[PDB]
Structures are given as C-alpha cells and as structure tokens.
Amino acid sequence: ATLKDITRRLKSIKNIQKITKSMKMVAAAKYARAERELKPARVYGVGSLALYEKA
C-alpha cells in the first residue's frame, strides 16, 4: 500500500499489542487468585463426591 496506509495499519497493530499485553497481565493475576481459591474448593468437592465412588 501507500505510506499512509502502512502508517495507520502499524499504529493499529501497536495499539492491539499493548492491549493484549495488558490483558495477559490481568488474566495472570486473576489466575493466581483462582488457583489460590481452587485448592480448598478442590478438597471440598472431592469430599462431596466421595460417597458415590465409595458406594
């Protein structure tokens, strides 16, 4: 394309990359919290399933 087409496309992709990096960071934080909260719920749910696999 022409120079302005390339410039606009490059700016758009740079914005997209910035946004995806930020979202990766947010998702990583939420993941850490989710694992932390998943351990106790893991034991709780496994216990609740205990009966059916035992009987």
Binding site: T7, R8, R9, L10, K11, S12, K14, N15, I16, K18
Partner: peptide, 17 residues
C-alpha cells in the same frame, strides 16, 4: 514511529469494523 489513541478505528481494517 509511534502509536496514538483511537488508531484501531482510524485504520479501518477488519478490527475497525
């Protein structure tokens, strides 16, 4: 070369629409 706010809709590519 830098990037500026409101550029995704300035390109008008697929992401803009």
């Amino acid at each position: 070369v830098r990037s500026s706010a409101g550029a995704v809709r300035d390109a008008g590519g697929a992401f803009g629409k």
